[PDB]
């Protein structure tokens, strides 16, 4: 009737892939895999993907394809008491578009600064460098003071981010114009690439979601030839089976697979909404998850061969140079490694292009999910001019991310990365899977999938939908809420007001679910049983 379809069946696959792959498969998976037993981490990763990731992925895809609605309009067909899921997802997507869209701005600054035969972060006689600028080893005669720092680390913490002008999260100091201009350019690109919808999206995804693979292959070929590259591959693949006895490895595997596949976020619902009715979403979800896992593996190889080259040029124990987890592994360590390799300009250019193209499609999908959701929710005031309400949300996200462009921006982006996403998204996805597999009835869902696909899913899928994945998400939630992390960044701890603000932000989205079921008191008054029986059952189709 009014919904649109993908231009090609490959466009949907490429869009879901580009949404699934991001920097979380480049700098987040290799570090977690090496820290948690090395090569022995692939077994719990595979187990948690088979039990937790693929079932939720396939359920979400089938649901979004059948009901043909976003993250807000679909709940009128399952449980109208959980309509606040869409608003909570909108809040979480606002927070994510605020914080995640700054890593791409840093990558863009590095890209526009790398246009020189001699990269800036390979020297030390600059205007941003202090006396602690000790160049890369290249020799073992020069000692290393505890205050000494590499030139690339100083270029990252004093030029591109300018963290030395802010004394910490207590005072951001001021906003920079360079990062502001880069993030404005990238937001303009996102808006001019996501305005029309899936028909225009699937045409840019052909370039944005396929370019990272060519660059990954080029970097793999370059790293496998560097001297001492076998050490990185060995340390990344040599298993440590003693680690598998601790629950931390399984918790980290569950978290990594849930944040790499990313179910329960309304993006998959929106993408499957624009899909055909009789489309075999089963094969689509399977191949998407397999491609995501294989991309994580290939990128781990790519990163660790270069870290092994570094540990051969510098001293050994890649674990020592890979001490920090975050964007520093890509902007400090890998930056040094690129600046130290022959033909550094081209490699830096393609690496930063890969980072930008890995973030771009992820932001595309994250914004298109909320756009489709609110459009299918409010078709009377919107969805008649889709060119609007996208500029509005882009401007809102830009004004919300302006606080990250300040000099103390790393602190704010880490605070938003460590509190706004994890527990809120986990609880949202858990309660969504509960509402779909328990309240909506697993029989009404299995017969539905049998009608659409032509065959009812196996008993394994019913087991993974009713008991396995809900207990999985509940386990992740209980593990995250039990150990509040004391996060630190660049030798700077976080005060208690920071933890309070992070707790308030993390609950600023999940709290949208109970307030909806409470404020519905005015809409449907009467006896409690009346509400319980009128809010669970969906409206007449």
């Amino acid at each position, epitope marked *: 009737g009014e919904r649109e379809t993908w231009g090609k069946k490959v466009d949907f696959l490429l869009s879901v892939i580009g949404y699934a792959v991001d920097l979380g498969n480049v700098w987040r998976f290799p570090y977690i895999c090496y820290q948690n037993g090395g090569g022995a981490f692939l077994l719990p990763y595979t187990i948690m993907a088979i039990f937790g990731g693929i079932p939720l992925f396939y359920m979400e895809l089938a649901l979004g394809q059948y009901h043909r609605n976003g993250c807000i309009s679909i709940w009128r067909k399952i449980c109208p008491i959980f309509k606040g899921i869409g608003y909570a997802i909108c809040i979480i997507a606002f927070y994510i578009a605020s914080y995640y869209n700054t890593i791409m701005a840093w990558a863009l600054y590095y890209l526009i600064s790398s246009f020189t035969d001699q990269l800036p972060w390979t020297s030390c006689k600059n205007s941003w460098n202090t006396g602690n600028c000790t160049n890369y080893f290249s020799e073992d005669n020069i000692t*290393w003071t*505890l205050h000494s720092t590499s030139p690339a680390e100083e270029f990252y913490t004093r030029h591109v981010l300018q963290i030395h002008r802010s004394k910490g999260l207590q005072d951001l100091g001021g906003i920079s114009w360079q990062l502001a201009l880069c993030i404005m350019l990238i937001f303009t690109v996102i808006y001019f690439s996501i305005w029309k919808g899936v028909k225009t999206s699937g045409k840019v995804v052909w370039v944005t979601a396929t370019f990272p693979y060519i660059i990954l292959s080029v970097l793999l070929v370059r790293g496998a030839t560097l001297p*001492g590259a076998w*050490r990185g591959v060995l340390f990344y693949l040599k298993p440590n089976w003693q680690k598998l006895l601790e629950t931390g490895v399984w918790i980290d595997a569950a978290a990594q697979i849930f944040f790499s596949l990313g179910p329960g976020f309304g993006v998959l619902l929106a993408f499957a909404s624009y899909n055909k009715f009789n489309n075999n979403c089963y094969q689509d979800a399977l191949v998407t998850s397999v491609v995501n896992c294989m991309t994580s593996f290939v990128s781990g190889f790519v990163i660790f061969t270069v870290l092994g080259y570094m540990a051969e040029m510098r*001293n050994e*124990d890649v674990s*020592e140079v890979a001490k920090d987890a975050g964007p520093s592994l890509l902007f400090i360590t890998y930056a040094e490694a690129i600046a130290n390799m022959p033909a550094s300009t081209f490699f830096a250019i393609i690496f930063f292009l890969m980072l930008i193209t890995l973030g771009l499609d992820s932001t595309f999908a994250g914004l298109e999910g909320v756009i489709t959701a609110v459009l299918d929710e409010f078709p009377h005031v919107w969805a008649k001019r889709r060119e609007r309400f996208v500029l509005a949300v882009v401007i809102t996200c830009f004004f919300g991310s302006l606080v990250t462009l300040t000099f103390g921006g790393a602190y704010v982006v880490k605070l938003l990365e460590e509190y706004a996403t994890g527990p809120a998204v986990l609880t949202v996805a858990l309660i969504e899977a509960v509402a779909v597999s328990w309240f909506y009835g697993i029989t009404q869902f299995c017969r539905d999938v049998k009608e659409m696909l032509g065959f009812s899913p196996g008993w394994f899928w019913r087991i993974c939908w009713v008991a396995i994945s809900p207990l999985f998400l509940l386990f992740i939630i209980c593990s995250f809420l039990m150990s509040p992390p004391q996060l630190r960044l660049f*030798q700077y701890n976080y005060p208690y007001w920071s933890i309070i603000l992070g707790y308030c932000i993390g609950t600023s989205s999940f709290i949208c679910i109970p307030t909806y079921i409470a404020y519905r008191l005015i809409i449907t008054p009467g006896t409690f049983k009346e509400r319980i029986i009128k809010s669970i059952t969906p409206e007449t189709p």
Partner: antibody
Framework: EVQLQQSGPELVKPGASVKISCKASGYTFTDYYMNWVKQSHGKSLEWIGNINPNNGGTSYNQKFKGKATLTVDKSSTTAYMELRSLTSEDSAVYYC????????????WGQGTTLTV | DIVMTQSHKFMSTSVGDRVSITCKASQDVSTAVAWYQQKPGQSPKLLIYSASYRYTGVPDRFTGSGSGTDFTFTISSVQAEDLAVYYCQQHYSIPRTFGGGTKLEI
């Protein structure tokens, strides 16, 4: 020209708890590590722990989980190592060592506290 | 852990010859191998770090060689003031581990 001073010999009751102080002087104390090594009687050396006088960081050996705690007081540039639950099996000479960050060569060594149980 | 062994604790040639003791490494350490000189009763002083660079303030006679797995301490024609034990420390990974050592008699 740059020597690290320590305490002298003492008698430790088996099962009690004691400490070993390392007063460093000669260079910028807040610029390098402060590592402890345990040399058993007529045997090989053994690295115990690591101290970062900039932020009180620690990095101790795996075989020294609950054997020695490491603290630092950069007021008079000293290094403390409390030995808890000491028996007659590890009581030996204790050296205080400084080492830069990751060439990790032990530059200067203490005088040698022959800690006898 | 990264265990580091040495040769026998007795075989050492007298003055005039070349006393060269070895250090077998468990894992592949590129060049991160140091050497120390602990005279009887004194504290160990640094002699050679990274297996090829001698520390500032040591005589030119003390030379280190070897890389990868076989590390050799080359102290030829020992004088009357080199009788000590020499340990073999690696800078690969925490925890760092020393070696057994060997005396140079006579």
């Amino acid at each position: 020209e740059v020597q690290l001073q320590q305490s002298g010999p003492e008698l430790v009751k088996p099962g009690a708890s004691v400490k070993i102080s390392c007063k460093a002087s000669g260079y910028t104390f807040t610029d390098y590590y402060m590592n402890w090594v345990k040399q058993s009687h007529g045997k090989s050396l053994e690295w115990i722990g690591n101290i970062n006088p900039n932020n009180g960081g620690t990095s101790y050996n795996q075989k020294f989980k609950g054997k020695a705690t490491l603290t630092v007081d950069k007021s008079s540039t000293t290094a403390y190592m409390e030995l808890r639950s000491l028996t007659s099996e590890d009581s030996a000479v204790y050296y205080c060592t400084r080492s830069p960050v990751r060439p990790y060569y032990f530059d200067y060594w203490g005088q040698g506290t022959t800690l006898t149980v | 852990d990264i265990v580091m062994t040495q040769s026998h604790k007795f075989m050492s040639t007298s003055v005039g010859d070349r006393v060269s003791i070895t250090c077998k490494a468990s894992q592949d350490v590129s060049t991160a191998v140091a050497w120390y000189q602990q005279k009887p009763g004194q504290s160990p002083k640094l002699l050679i770090y990274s297996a090829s660079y001698r520390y500032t303030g040591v005589p030119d006679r003390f030379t280190g060689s070897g890389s990868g797995t076989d590390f050799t301490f080359t102290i030829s024609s020992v004088q009357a003031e080199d009788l000590a034990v020499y340990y073999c420390q690696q800078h690969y990974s925490i925890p760092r581990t020393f070696g057994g050592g060997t005396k140079l008699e006579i």
